[PDB]
Amino acid sequence: PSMMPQWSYMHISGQDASEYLSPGLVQFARATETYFSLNNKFRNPTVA
Amino acid sequence: EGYNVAQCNMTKDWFLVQMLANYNIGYQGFYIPESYKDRMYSFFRNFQPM
Numbered sequence: 001p002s003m004m005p006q007w008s009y010m011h012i013s014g015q016d017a018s019e020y021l022s023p024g025l026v027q028f029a030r031a032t033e034t035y036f037s038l039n040n041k042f043r044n045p046t047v048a
Numbered sequence: 049e050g051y052n053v054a055q056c057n058m059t060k061d062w063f064l065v066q067m068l069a070n071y072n073i074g075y076q077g078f079y080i081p082e083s084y085k086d087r088m089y090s091f092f093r094n095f096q097p098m
Contacts, residue, residue, distance in 0.1 A: 037076055 016044040
């Protein structure tokens with residue numbers, strides 16, 4: 001389970017959540033934001 | 049037997065219903081609703097258990 005610098009694998013750094021999901025899932029999430037949350041399940045890393 | 053909440057006499061079910069219908073909260077665990085979405089004649093503001 002260590003075929004890459006593990007930081008990307010654990011989302012310490014790399015691309016944001018809205019760009020590593022099956023886009024259907026993102027459509028589903030943005031389509032039901034109000035009455036059922038999902039936006040606090042995956043972290044988008046930040047890099048200085 | 050098993051149907052009080054917040055050390056009051058109220059049932060869990062009624063509490064859940066009121067929380068939902070007042071703020072769409074409860075399915076994701078309760079917590080104090082934010083200020084602006086809770087005005088003077090709200091529900092949670094005037095909930096005194098004794």
